[PDB]
Design a protein around this ligand. Structure first.
Ligand SMILES: NC(=O)c1ccc[n+]([C@@H]2O[C@H](COP(=O)([O-])OP(=O)([O-])OC[C@H]3O[C@@H](n4cnc5c(N)[nH+]cnc54)[C@H](O)[C@@H]3O)[C@@H](O)[C@H]2O)c1
Ligand SMILES: NC(=O)c1ccc[n+]([C@@H]2O[C@H](COP(=O)([O-])OP(=O)([O-])OC[C@H]3O[C@@H](n4cnc5c(N)[nH+]cnc54)[C@H](O)[C@@H]3O)[C@@H](O)[C@H]2O)c1
Ligand SMILES: OCc1c(F)c(F)c(F)c(F)c1F
Ligand SMILES: OCc1c(F)c(F)c(F)c(F)c1F
Ligand SMILES: [Zn+2]
Ligand SMILES: [Zn+2]
Ligand SMILES: [Zn+2]
Ligand SMILES: [Zn+2]
Lengths: 374, 374
């Protein structure tokens, strides 16, 4: 039995920015009250994890990163009611405490208990469950999924279908749900509309899936890497454009293509310039633009507010706008009912021990999602 | 007797920026096909007219400004079907051609025939109906209401109730409808919500009216001129704050007052800094901020897009989001049925000949709306 005991296991520790992960033994404390210890089964490599490595996202180091995953409950602390040992679960990088003003709001999902805005890199109680070489190691977004075992707060975990394939549904923990919800819930894409999707990685592909599901008539994919176009078309893009092919700015190209601007645009990269371009290419009177990408820490964009005064709507969201604990189980149920596909997003499946190679595939432009299996 | 003939009348011509208007004789050509010549009865002095004088708003000079008005049709050009001589009318600074993609869109109101985005200062045909001292004089927004007679395109005029009091309902041509619609139509303020209104002039007062009509529980007015607070409370503000009273930035004050951010905020001034402050003070996960004020020409704001990524919505609108020709007559009908009040906005009345004194009153901070009578 491991319940109630410290577990020694393998994890990928990030000791400092711009260095490879170190795959080594960590100690994982047992869960305290209202905490859940999970044996990880699969975790995805998301660009946001690379942002921690690159310094694009600032979070306390050293750290166990990883936020898109699925696993099986090993043990629960006192007072846990929503999961039991043996349950399949997805950690929730956006929690759902159910009690704060956001949780109670019909349209908010960015629960005030989150560790995104002002990250401490701890459990809710302000302490860490991880040690490595005698040193405390930080958590990441309350999830820390780059470990054979993690500990999460109960508000940061959802129980899912016991028959779920964990090596696929881990994507519901971040990239699929984020893109899909950005289209269907946040933008509320309409039937017959024209959509523009900037960035054709895992998240942008999921935005395309949602735009197609919503009945868009035209879905224009934009990426500087033309190797991304074939898969974008497979999942619903009607056209793809590479800005590097044009003498004019791409907002002008897209405005012309759409006979005066698109209905919905999405920034799914993380660049300040593309955020402004995406806003500009939506129709000036009634267009909607959604920011999904995460830009470099503490950098401001510059824009002319006449873009908004004419009638545009500009919004952003975390996790597709989904209230996390309510939505994850339903998304998995919908996947099990064949309502959407996840295989198009998965280009590589590697053992966990190859985490660095998986990040190199992302950085080189060669992968969409690599799933790491424990 | 004047139908088909040039009319000589008095208008207020702006020859140069940063100068008084010159009340002098102009020649007003008869209406061409699909044009309407209107005898003006009353026109309001709106801050946007002042922006033309100050250079905040760039439009070709020399010009006959004025855009908030009501009058009586003197004559119609060939092919006009929607008004007749003797009808009471409001000129529409935002046209409604009824044929473009925006006019056909359920939400859009910024008709593509507008003369706001890239002002030419002409009729729809690219020519002027005004001569002064033998020189052609520009139109403004297709309306040019600072004249005893103007000529407008048919898509820029609405017929209104024959019993309408024109010295009141001119405010439906801009300031009332813009602020009211910004709350009820653009923001879609909800019952029980907390609203923050930056700027307590005529437009911001109208926003407050709209927020109160929509059922807001708290309406916080923000102005650096505390003389504006008594009327703001009369029309529905629950509390007023002056940024100059505080050591902390007002977005922090408002976030504290609203226990974590407001539901709806409105920028009703025209400053880049207050546009960002207004966005910041709405709740980070589900807040909505609407830009109403007109900022200085060609200037960009700087902002951190993480404000949006957490869930905020940022939008702007012209004329309260109202499709102009459909909406203006209905708004007048609702006024005649006492569904809203206009008298709280009217602080001064002057003859047209005292236009410069009217502008002095606005610039000093003393007036809300001065109504000029012809
Ligand atoms: N809002 C959320 O909740 C949330 C969740 C998940 C991911 N993210 C962010 O979303 C973004 C996309 O993540 P991902 O899909 O995993 O990343 P990814 O797989 O790296 O995809 C990004 C795509 O952008 C393309 N690209 C780069 N520069 C440009 C350019 N100038 N113009 C057009 N295309 C360009 C690039 O070739 C690539 O295909 C990242 O910034 C993530 O951090 C946000
Ligand atoms: N979007 C539209 O369709 C539309 C139509 C009508 C008016 N406008 C614009 O709306 C704005 C307001 O017009 P208005 O109500 O006639 O103008 P106004 O009567 O000048 O009112 C502006 C108010 O802002 C106050 N103010 C100035 N600076 C600050 C500050 N830093 N903080 C807080 N309050 C401050 C000022 O004291 C005044 O009471 C102007 O920019 C107009 O050009 C836009
Ligand atoms: O990919 C999801 C994701 C985000 F959207 C962020 F805004 C963030 F800061 C982060 F760490 C993260 F993992
Ligand atoms: O007051 C209404 C109004 C506007 F909202 C503008 F954006 C504009 F450019 C203008 F000239 C105007 F009069
Ligand atoms: Zn919460
Ligand atoms: Zn992610
Ligand atoms: Zn139109
Ligand atoms: Zn105005």
């Amino acid at each position: 039995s491991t319940a109630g005991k410290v577990i020694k296991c393998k994890a990928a520790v990030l000791w400092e920015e711009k260095k490879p992960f170190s795959i080594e033994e960590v100690e994982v404390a047992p869960p305290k009250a209202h905490e859940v210890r999970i044996k990880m089964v699969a975790t995805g490599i998301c660009r946001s994890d690379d942002h921690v490595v690159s310094g694009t996202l600032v979070t306390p180091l050293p750290v166990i990163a990883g936020h898109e995953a699925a696993g099986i409950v090993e043990s629960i602390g006192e007072g846990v009611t929503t999961v039991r040992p043996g349950d399949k679960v997805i950690p929730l990088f956006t929690p759902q405490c159910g009690k704060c003003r956001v949780c109670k709001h019909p349209e908010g999902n960015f629960c005030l208990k989150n560790d995104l805005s002002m990250p401490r890199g701890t459990m809710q109680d302000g302490t860490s469950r991880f040690t490595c070489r005698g040193k405390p190691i930080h958590h990441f977004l309350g999830t820390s999924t780059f470990s054979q075992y993690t500990v999460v707060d109960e508000i940061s975990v959802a129980k899912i279908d016991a028959a779920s394939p964990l090596e696929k549904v881990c994507l519901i923990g971040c990239g699929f749900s984020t893109g899909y919800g950005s289209a269907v819930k946040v933008a509320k894409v309409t039937q017959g509309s024209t959509c523009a999707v900037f960035g054709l990685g895992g998240v942008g592909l999921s935005v395309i899936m949602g735009c197609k599901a919503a009945g868009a008539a035209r879905i224009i994919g934009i990426d500087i890497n033309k190797d991304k176009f074939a898969k974008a078309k497979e999942v619903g893009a009607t056209e793809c454009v590479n800005p590097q092919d044009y003498k004019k700015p791409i907002q002008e190209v897209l405005t012309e293509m759409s006979n005066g601007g698109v209905d919905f645009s999405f920034e799914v990269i993380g660049r300040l310039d593309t955020m402004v371009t995406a806003l500009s290419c939506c129709q000036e009177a009634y267009g909607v633009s959604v920011i999904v990408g995460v830009p470099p820490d503490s950098q401001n964009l510059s824009m002319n507010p006449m873009l908004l005064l004419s009638g545009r709507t500009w919004k952003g969201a975390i996790f597709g706008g989904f209230k996390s604990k309510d939505s994850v189980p339903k998304l998995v149920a919908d996947f099990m009912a064949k309502k959407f596909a996840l295989d198009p997003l998965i280009t590589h499946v590697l053992p966990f021990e190859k985490i660095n190679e998986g990040f190199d595939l992302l950085r080189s432009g060669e992968s969409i999602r690599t799933i790491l299996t424990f």
